[PDB]
Write a protein that binds this ligand. Structure first.
Ligand code: FAD
Ligand code: FAD
Ligand code: FAD
Ligand code: TPP
Ligand code: TPP
Ligand code: TPP
Ligand code: MG
Ligand code: MG
Ligand code: MG
Lengths: 577, 577, 577
């Protein structure tokens, strides 16, 4: 007979898990012994928070289960930031939360916590093992819940019970459902959407991450009804590239004509998006297609709700949607889009290649050009989100992106890159780090060195909490607490045994970044950038930066955009005569 | 400008809510004033627990939102049993939990509780209002969550904030998605199910509540592959009637050949069921079709998982499923089914019409014959669940049933009947009450009298917690705490102003129950029944009654069955020669 | 070897527990079998909510542990209202929450709930048993926590584990600390209070339940510094009787000069009170003595905080407090107090003995005169709280009182009386019931009959939610939802086998109530009272009734007072010349 720890690891191995991220100790020793004897690799991190980020990033890249593990009490407590992030991102993650010995539960014991209560908000399933047999059962339920799309699962395992005898295999013997059902809409909701589209003279589509598997259908619908296509940040990687109807992104980090096209069309269709900034959304005549009905109408007035998959809904309605031959609205919005992008480049990035200290938008433009066509980019929360949104492209859809776009935590970039890089050491992974984010989990440079992960950590080092400095400028409150003395991350990385370079001259950015990106190993690129590069229209308020101003707005943060302008201009040249 | 209380009630009225069940007080006075001025009826109950049961039953009958409401602190605390029941039953219920004044939150004030924390387990959405505008928003989110099938929603409203100004209408103006999407399976999961069916020589279908809208498809599949059809208790009302393949129900309250057909077939297919008694389920070769992937494999080994709707999955696979011409397995199971039903009638209900005290199975047989073809039956948890399962039929599918089949609470029958009867006073509603259940919420007889609800409360009065007496007999522990001195519910009902009859002679059951069921008003029927009528095989253990014995079993509680035997016998006579 | 169920009951028996209140079923059968074999009596209730109220009332009367018990899932869910009440009242209660079988936890099983999470707010200790040995340990910890004054303890016991082997006795062998430590104040805080008293020319003491064991010390301090003594409702039973400095109670149910004496004195001292209605409390110069430092300053500005016991603090300061020879303030407040009480009697209860329907204040005056000198009174939340506060006296301190004065739940009176009466069947127990409260848990009349508890249920039957009708009159909102058709509780009680009388003529109240109170058995007294008897000053607002108006007030609800005026008048006649 095997123990429950051995059955746990055999079940994960049989499901194809290749790695577990974590930090060993106490109630986790029987589980780590079983890992040693299996083909699963143990990936040691310095802070268990990084293990939960790394597992979430691995799962977003692979589309499969990923796993993190931590010791009792304080050990598993450290998972929590990464579990919130993974849960909000819809990752397929199992967290093994080792727990104090069962006989000491309820006695205010050394290290006691109640993880089975603490992790309820950052999980779709979270239960405690109380015996080997029941442990097999709740491991199945946890894996089946996360694979069905319910978000993070936590299994809480008192250390003693991991050494108890395994269950009889009834539940570990099951095949897990990991398929993708095809969700067609209710015919009554679909018919109301057809009527709304056919009655409208102009339509705009606004897409989010829910169009990941619906590019062909969204483009086919747009060609038929001559609709501009805008996106939320979660839709950018899927719908912006090679899109003849492209009109940009809404929100403060937005760009182009998206806000105007969304608000001026007779009908706006929200496709697979939960974009939260309601002040940028119209209310007059909006449809929304979402696979989770509970999300419909969360962000603005929706008159035509449709619970359904985007691709299946468009396939179902298309034969009933009339072709629109008038593309005057689309042409006006494509022209306004290109004019707006050209205008922000002229206003904000004139001679940006000579700006000192180095302008982060110059770095981001060069990074987009130099990085591989299939690189993974990870994005630290803060001003790196602006540089990703406005400069990092996805030609042919072959790059991947991982960030904290929903939970919005700092310090995610380097741990996300550790997980993404572990999937395939031959694929380039670029972590766009802030100095605040990197400092917050600095010890994970020791993890990169230990595992020899050949990721490229690009530090936008401006010695400032740049996004907070923006929020304070916008509020009109004296700058305080954001900027501190400079740190030399290249020297810290070199002291940790990582190849590094420090870039201070804009004239050497292109050559030094090309050399670093081509280095066959881990490398940290410490770029000293301008802390005052973020430009802000004086009319933006702290209530808008914080997201609680409901009054209609079309204003975005200042700054330029990058290579997205090439598609905007080819779309103008291809407008039918 | 309106207040938030007025906007709350206008939004519910615009959505078609006709009634709110509750008990007025304190922070709920502004909301009740708005109800008075609207077309919504206030249905006063004596204990707010009954309001939450009544709302859950109303929604199960109508398929639409139902609403309950209660005052701060202790008032809304009383909702909780009915919210768990409604939530487990998948009802579409909004609970308005009035709360203490916002300025006193956090001060250990008079009546203070934290309902926004307490009701997390019995809801899919539960949040606190902190201003009129945000209150409009979370009311929308709560209604959209319950209408999308996520279970109960709770909106917690500090009393003072109900008098604050209303939001601007952005969220109340939305149309709620209440449609039913059509969920086809992933083609890879569907193809594996086709291969399993075509490889199997014999197949049995085991259906639950998830086949509600798939009768035609289940029967078409059964005719093609010659499969017996069994059911869980939640499937009985939908699949047993007019079913040429009928083989009964599994579990301790089960009957017929279902356990044998499910365990002897080469392949068992679980269709829309989460039947929890794993010791009755095989493990060797099982498929499961469920619309919620997280439920697959919860109860036994599943080798062919399919996330999908039952009807859409069967429609998709049918052209690829080969017709089976050999119906030897089906014929053997139909013959065994009828033999087993005839045997339990001969063993347990010989001369049952002369048994004294009155046998509850004699009452249940007469109640099935006399009740209307479209009656609603509500079923009190306990031995009434056995009498429903084995005696109350659903010819042509026109009756409806409400019970606590998942949460398993006592005392639900009379409050469920209050909600079901409020939907249509011209429809017959029969509450199958136990003396324990009725005593537990006895004050709701005052509610029946106040609202003149013409329901028929049939009390199986055996002065005993009959199901607990069974559990103790099965364990082999001396009877204690279950049986107490007799109560005259007919005299209590008459003292409350309700028409009543007391039935003690088996020779008068048919005439007295016919007269009472035909009474044009509320009526309580107090039937003095035999507390020792539940027969138990000595091999049943307390571990089996409690549901924690995993060893394979086919043993059911003793007792007979009713009119279901007529279909069993016609199915034998129609077996092709 | 014994089982954990047997060890649980042996441990309670060894600690002196005489009874357990509850309702048998499932996971509780092994525990009830152990009770049968012990000397503990099982007290069957009809709804487990009543068991938790009865245990809380028993403990308040005895000063010892009391116990309630309920079955898994829905069974223990029903305890919750009574656990909140017992917890807020500081009762010493163990709740045995039977739970689903451990192997099914986490599987969404039949009846599954998580009581170990649900009951966190209504308990000081709440943990789950996961084995027999750890179960012995957390039973000790639960008993020691409640006996040390931390409020309710809940032990959650999966049914299967109750049959597991008992622990080794290490923790059940301990003696529980149930002593009362003597908490002297910090000398620095005490010296600041001495300076405040000696600097003040006039002082008023305002006492709550924390003066229970400090009557002699409070009176000695008042004689020395010539201070009026007022009380919160929780202090009334301890400090009003035979008090030469008595000036009444504050709050809307208040009376006499208390609000004026508290606000006009140079120094107000809060002694053992957490009175929550801040608009009645001054802010200028207030001291507060409380044994729980976290409570100091919860309700108004406190300049002289003292963490300490009332009696020990007064004993410590008394030698340093200077005698005040000027009693002009005390004399002015004693005269104003008696004038105010005489005025409300003249305004509101002129010829009250002839008022029809019967006036509840006439009933309350007669009930105070006729009830025994050592009776227990239980008080249903609602208008019965006004009648208790203004009419039920405690001469020589020999009566006891139980109510829901902090949690404020309806329906507590009859279940509180069941627990208080079970302590000593020879002691008179009077339940002051409202028709709303009694209807809410009406089935507990069957409990009174079953156990032959000789309590006297006095129903103030006005067919109205009287306190809510007051709140609506005060708000100026049309009356709705409070008054319904009349119920005959005397006929319902007689149908339940309880002696009853229906009183409708004011001329027969005294004789019929005297006869009923002297009946040697259970009796229900259904008094048809005037629903419009509660008088309200038009200046009271719904914000004041709800407790969120902070503006200074001295206004109380209209109505008269009773025999308290005799002490007010003797105190005037004894003012030194
Ligand atoms: C510092 C910072 C600033 C930010 N600023 C902005 C900004 O200015 N602009 C911006 O756009 N974002 C911004 N974001 C991100 C923003 O908060 C949201 O996370 C993002 O807009 C949501 O993108 P989304 O709608 O694509 O994804 P989600 O919020 O994940 O929504 C996806 C939706 O698709 C649905 N869905 C999934 N699959 C399907 C399917 N097959 N069919 C149908 N529906 C489906 C889901 O149910 C869900 O409702 C910022 C983030 C950070 C960290
Ligand atoms: C005292 C008592 C005794 C009991 N004894 C028994 C007994 O002996 N036998 C018994 O059978 N029950 C018994 N029960 C009830 C039992 O506990 C379960 O509640 C019941 O078996 C579950 O029935 P079900 O599977 O139909 O419903 P559910 O548990 O509600 O499961 C329905 C399933 O269908 C799925 N679904 C819903 N819609 C669709 C769709 N369109 N397509 C696909 N899937 C869908 C759901 O996701 C879910 O998994 C008892 C109850 C009581 C109160
Ligand atoms: C419908 C209704 C209306 C009400 N209206 C009123 C009203 O108008 N007026 C009114 O007064 N009440 C009213 N109440 C009750 C009110 O809400 C409070 O519960 C009550 O005033 C508190 O009384 P208390 O301060 O004595 O008790 P508690 O709130 O229990 O406070 C006792 C304090 O004493 C402290 N303490 C305990 N022992 C010691 C010790 N040995 N030494 C020192 N400190 C100690 C405790 O830590 C605590 O802070 C009403 C109740 C109801 C149900
Ligand atoms: C753990 C955490 N702390 C604080 C914040 C708030 N926050 C959001 S962005 C930001 C600054 C991020 O700093 P850095 O990584 O240097 O990037 P910058 O904005 O300068 O690019 C801060 C403080 C956060 N979301 N997460
Ligand atoms: C609130 C609650 N308390 C206890 C139980 C446990 N229980 C389940 S069935 C049963 C007896 C039900 O009694 P009654 O209504 O008289 O029906 P009977 O079994 O006699 O038909 C009990 C105690 C429950 N599930 N719910
Ligand atoms: C469970 C519960 N529901 C509602 C309330 C609100 N409430 C407080 S007093 C009151 C009326 C009490 O009625 P009754 O027992 O008839 O006494 P009355 O005020 O008429 O004397 C109500 C509705 C409460 N606190 N508890
Ligand atoms: Mg920075
Ligand atoms: Mg019974
Ligand atoms: Mg009343």
């Amino acid at each position: 007979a095997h123990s429950y720890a051995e059955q746990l690891i055999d079940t994960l191995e049989a499901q194809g898990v290749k790695r577990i991220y974590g930090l060993v100790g106490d109630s986790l020793n029987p589980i780590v012994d079983a890992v040693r004897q299996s083909d699963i690799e143990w990936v040691h991190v310095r802070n268990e928070e990084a293990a939960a980020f790394a597992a979430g990033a691995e799962s977003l890249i692979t589309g499969e289960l990923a796993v993190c593990a931590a010791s009792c009490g304080p050990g598993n407590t450290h998972l929590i930031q990464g579990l919130y992030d993974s849960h909000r991102n819809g990752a397929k993650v199992l967290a093994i939360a080792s727990h104090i010995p069962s006989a000491q539960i309820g006695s205010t014991f050394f290290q006691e916590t109640h993880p089975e209560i603490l992790f309820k908000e950052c999980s779709g399933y979270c239960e405690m093992v109380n015996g080997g047999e029941q442990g097999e059962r709740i491991l199945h339920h946890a894996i089946q819940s996360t694979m069905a799309g319910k978000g993070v699962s936590v299994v809480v395992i008192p250390g003693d019970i991991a050494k108890e005898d395994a269950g009889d295999g009834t539940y570990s013997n099951s095949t897990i459902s990991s398929g993708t059902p095809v969700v067609f809409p209710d015919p009554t909701e679909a018919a109301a959407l057809v009527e709304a589209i056919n009655n409208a003279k102009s339509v705009t589509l606004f897409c989010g991450a829910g169009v990941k598997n619906a590019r062909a259908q969204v483009l086919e619908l747009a060609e038929k009804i001559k609709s501009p296509i805008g996106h939320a940040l979660g839709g950018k990687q899927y719908i912006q590239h090679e899109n003849p109807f492209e009109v940009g992104m809404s929100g403060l980090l937005g760009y182009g004509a998206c806000v105007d096209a969304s608000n001026e069309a007779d009908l706006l269709i929200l496709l697979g998006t939960d974009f939260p900034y309601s002040d940028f959304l119209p209310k007059d005549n909006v449809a929304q297609v979402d696979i989770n009905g509970a999300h419909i109408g969360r962000r603005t007035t929706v008159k035509y709700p449709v619970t359904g998959d985007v691709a299946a809904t468009i396939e179902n309605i298309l034969p009933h949607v009339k072709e629109k031959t008038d593309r005057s609205f689309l042409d006006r919005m494509l022209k306004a889009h290109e004019r707006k992008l050209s205008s922000v480049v002229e206003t904000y990035t004139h001679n940006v290649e000579k700006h000192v200290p180095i302008h982060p938008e110059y770095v981001a433009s060069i990074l987009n050009e130099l990085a591989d066509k299939d690189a993974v980019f990870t994005v630290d929360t803060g001003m790196c989100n602006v540089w990703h949104a406005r400069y990092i492209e996805n030609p042919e859809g072959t790059r991947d992106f991982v960030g904290s776009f929903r939970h919005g935590t700092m310090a995610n970039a380097l741990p996300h890159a550790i997980g993404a890089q572990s999937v395939d050491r031959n694929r380039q992974v670029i972590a766009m780090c802030g100095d605040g984010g990197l400092g917050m989990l600095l010890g994970e440079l020791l993890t990169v060195k230990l595992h020899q992960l050949p990721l490229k950590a690009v530090v936008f080092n401006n010695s400032s909490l740049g996004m907070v400095k923006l929020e304070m400028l916008v509020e009109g409150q004296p700058e305080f607490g954001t900027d501190h003395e400079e740190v030399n991350f290249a020297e810290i990385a070199a002291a940790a045994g990582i190849k590094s370079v420090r870039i201070t001259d804009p004239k050497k950015v292109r050559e030094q970044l090309a050399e670093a990106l081509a280095y066959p190993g881990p490398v940290l690129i410490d770029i000293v950038t301008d802390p005052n590069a973020l430009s802000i229209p004086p009319t933006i308020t702290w209530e808008q930066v914080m997201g609680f101003s409901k009054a209609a707005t079309r204003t975005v943060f200042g700054g330029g955009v990058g290579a997205m302008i090439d598609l905007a201009r080819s779309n103008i040249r291809n407008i039918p005569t």
